[PDB]
Structure 1
Amino acid sequence: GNVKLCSLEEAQRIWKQKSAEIYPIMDKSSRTRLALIICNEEFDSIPRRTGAEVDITGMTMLLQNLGYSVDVKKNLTASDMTTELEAFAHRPEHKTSDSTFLVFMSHGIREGICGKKHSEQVPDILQLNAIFNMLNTKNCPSLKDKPKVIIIQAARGDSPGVVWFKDSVXXXXXXXXXXXXX
């Protein structure tokens, strides 16, 4: 809808060049795409992600326009996040789906994403390895040879992400400044 569309001529001339280098698409009429949105806003001892509903609405509308059917889960702990991931991997609609999206949005550290009851005394963490391990071929064979996009909005740490250095500063002319001896 609000996403610029690929015309049939454009899509067919794209499909011509790298036909085997491109994942195949199940025709829209009978295909049933799926997607998952997990988002944590309220926490026990971690501040609340004010503005998360905006992202939920936007990503839901995007995955709708992309031909996927979104299922949103909100305010889960580590175990409940894992269990909803299991349930999503067990959805029989993946058997007739050509792809899927997994969008996780919460706080986080390097080890992983934060659960609802996360705390430095009682941590609630979902590791980077865990999602890949649960959505793989051995646990979700319904998506074998199918793209699985995982979008993660979280902090991978507590650092600023930037670094500051000094950066100040051959025509034969004269110096234009005044006030030298300062």
Structure 2
Amino acid sequence: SSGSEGNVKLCSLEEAQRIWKQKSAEIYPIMDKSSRTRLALIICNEEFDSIPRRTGAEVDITGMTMLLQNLGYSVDVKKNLTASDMTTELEAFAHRPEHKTSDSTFLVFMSHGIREGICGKKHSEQVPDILQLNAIFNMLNTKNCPSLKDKPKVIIIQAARGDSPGVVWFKDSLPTTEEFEDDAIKKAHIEKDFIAFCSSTPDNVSWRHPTMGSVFIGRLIEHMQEYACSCDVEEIFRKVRFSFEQPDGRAQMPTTERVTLTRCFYLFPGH
């Protein structure tokens, strides 16, 4: 009886009716299932030139691919890219015409993390190869990705550190090209409707179960599958943090970051 949705628990018609009746004015609207063309992007760096292999990556890619596909997203997976190539790929994704007939997107980045951003494949101390988190939000913003204006953009980042001070986030501050937008694109908020969810916790290896996925990605998939039907995604992220509250060996506490969501994002699995 299971199908496109896999192991994601379905929101019944009754359930969906209730959520929408109660808060429709502040729920991101979703598009008709039959005609919508949802897109997602996973970029996973596993094999690196000068830094450790990320054993566990393939289980994560497979799990997140399955998850997002079960939630209705056409998932485009890219592997072992330089920051330069990650940039080129981001811009292409941002420019896909399918987003015009979509209601939302997910972007997943799985790689090594340092203070300054996400490590590309050719990264070393001498020769840097870093994707700045900021560039993700910029390339998907209102001006650079007008097809996703007013639509939620969920950015999941697994950027495990090791000895370094995780991923830094947060600051507090040439002229661009005139592309002659209608004054309603011009006057829109540059950045709006983003939510990020970030883990920089290193992996604990089990040699008995090598190849196995990161606990973060596993815990996220588990919670998405169980609670996509009843909770909006902000709340699902909070519940992942709740699940990690009593520490085991390796303490995990992923942070929700750069929230410019204006409405609740419900996934309405089954619809």
- Answer yes or no: same fold by TM over 0.5: yes
Identity %: 100
> CA distance change for structure 1 residues 164 and 107 in 2, over 3 Å: closer, same or farther?
closer
- Alignment deviations for residues 51-87 of structure 1 (CA, whole Å, 9 cap, x no partner): 1000000000000100000000000001000000011
The structure with the larger Rg is 1
Give the counterpart of 2:148 among 140, 143, 150: 143
Equivalent position SS for 2:143: coil
Match of 2:215 in 1: none
Distance in 2 (CA, whole Å) between partners of 1:151 and 1:76 is 17
- Alignment deviations for residues 74-101 of structure 1 (CA, whole Å, 9 cap, x no partner): 0000100000001101111001010000
> CA distance change for structure 1 residues 161 and 144 in 2, over 3 Å: closer, same or farther?
closer
How many Å apart are 1:158 and its aligned residue? Answer: 2.6
Equivalent position SS for 2:19: helix
Q: Which runs of 5+ in 1 are unaligned?
A: 169-182
Whether the aligned pair in 1 keeps the contact of 2:44 and 2:79 (CA below 8 Å) is yes
> CA distance change for structure 1 residues 117 and 92 in 2, over 3 Å: closer, same or farther?
same
How many Å apart are 1:159 and its aligned residue? Answer: 5.0
CA RMSD of aligned residues (A): 5.9
Q: How many residues align?
A: 168
Equivalent position SS for 2:172: coil
How many Å apart are 1:166 and its aligned residue? Answer: 34
> CA distance change for structure 1 residues 124 and 29 in 2, over 3 Å: closer, same or farther?
same
Whether the aligned pair in 1 keeps the contact of 2:46 and 2:55 (CA below 8 Å) is yes
> CA distance change for structure 1 residues 104 and 164 in 2, over 3 Å: closer, same or farther?
closer
> CA distance change for structure 1 residues 21 and 92 in 2, over 3 Å: closer, same or farther?
same
1:47 aligns with 2:52: yes
How many Å apart are 1:161 and its aligned residue? Answer: 8.5
Calculate the TM-score normalised by the size of structure 2.
Answer: 0.58
> CA distance change for structure 1 residues 38 and 164 in 2, over 3 Å: closer, same or farther?
closer
